[PDB]
């Protein structure tokens, strides 16, 4: 048979759609904090599975290794983050990545117009959107125990898609692929990735491996 795959198209909650616009169509220095934000979500999802793990070891039969991979590809112009954390069910994605309103959205947008540092993004509960400071498209692949694997993808423009993922399986965790803008290729550079990591991510308690082409 010719392949047939299922897709669902969603609208970003109105206010999150505003934030994303602000984020993309405005200039901010200190963009490197996007990598700090990624690594912290990865680290939080890793905490989660490890906590569940204390009580139910079979929770790890989908993966015993707790770590975070970094993978820049200049050919594709992608920076990919990979962790072996808790993962996301379908609901988690939909409710966490765009559909549902965030308490922090209105305040953060205001704080930015008042001249606040883009770096505050995380504090206001919307740090995942820091990805659009450097990326024109973002793909999120995730696998949670007792559920299937999903792909979530957006180029912003107020919309996003979700689909049961047929691609390469990950046992468990989330993978985030950032398709960098052209002015932001500096984040595909090994030297700059190590510099950002060593500066902003030294509190992280899981090994970070950087794969270098
Ligand atoms: C790198 O971006 C991510 C990495 C992730 O592992 C995760 C993730 O799967 N989780 C689950 C979880 C559970 C408790 C607390 C936080 C989180 C985030 C998410 C992202 C971003 C796409 C938000």
Method by which the model was determined: X-ray
Domains contained in the chain, number = 1
For residue 205, the SS3 value is: coil
Question: Residues near ligand 1 with C-beta < 6 Å?
Answer: 38, 41-42, 44-45, 48, 81, 83, 85-88, 128, 140, 142, 174, 176
For ligand 1, atom 19: residue with the closest CA: 41
Beta bridge partners of 161: 9, 153
Q: Are 65 and 205 in contact (CB under 8 A)?
A: no
Cα angle, residue 188 at apex, residues 185 and 189 outer, rounded to 5°: 105
For atom 4 of ligand 1, the residue with the nearest CA is 42
Distance (Å, whole) CA 70 – CA 176 = 10
The Cβ-side half-sphere exposure at 168, using a 13 Å CA radius, reads 6
Beta-bridge mates of residue 150: 142, 164
Is residue 128 part of an annotated ligand binding site?
Answer: yes
Q: Which residues of 80-93 are buried (b: 16+ CB within 10 A; e: fewer)?
A: bbbbbbbbbbbebb
Question: How many angstroms is the resolution?
Answer: 2.2
Q: Give residue 48's domain range.
A: 1-213
What are the beta bridge partners of residue 175? 82, 141
β strands within the chain, DSSP E: 8-11, 68-73, 78-83, 135-143, 149-154, 159-164, 173-180, 208-210
The Cβ-side half-sphere exposure at 208, using a 13 Å CA radius, reads 23
* Burial of 121 per CB tally in 10 Å (0-12, 13-18, 19+): buried
Q: 52: domain CATH number?
A: 3.30.565.10
Probe residue for ligand 1, chosen from 85, 99, 139, 208 as the CB with the greatest number of ligand atoms within 8 Å: 85
**Does the annotation list 83 as a binding residue?**
yes
């Amino acid at each position: 048979p010719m392949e047939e795959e299922e897709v669902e198209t969603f609208a970003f909650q109105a206010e999150i759609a505003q934030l994303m616009s602000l984020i993309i169509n405005t200039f901010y220095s200190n963009k490197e904090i996007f990598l700090r934000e990624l690594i912290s979500n990865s680290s939080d999802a890793l905490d989660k599975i490890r906590y569940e793990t204390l009580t139910d070891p079979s929770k790890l039969d989908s993966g015993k290794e707790l770590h975070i991979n970094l993978i820049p590809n200049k050919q594709d112009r992608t920076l990919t983050i990979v962790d072996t954390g808790i993962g996301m069910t379908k609901a988690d994605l939909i409710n966490n990545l765009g559909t549902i309103a965030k308490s922090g959205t209105k305040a953060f947008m205001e704080a930015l117009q008042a001249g606040a540092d883009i770096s505050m993004i995380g504090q206001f509960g919307v740090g995942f959107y820091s990805a659009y400071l450097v990326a024109e498209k973002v793909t999120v692949i995730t696998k949670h125990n007792d559920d299937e694997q999903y792909a979530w993808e957006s180029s912003a423009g107020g919309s996003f898609t979700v689909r049961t993922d047929t691609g390469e399986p990950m046992g468990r965790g989330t993978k985030v692929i950032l398709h960098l803008k052209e002015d932001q290729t500096e984040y595909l550079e090994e030297r700059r990735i190590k510099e950002i990591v060593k500066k902003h991510s030294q509190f992280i308690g899981y090994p970070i491996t950087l794969f270098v082409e």
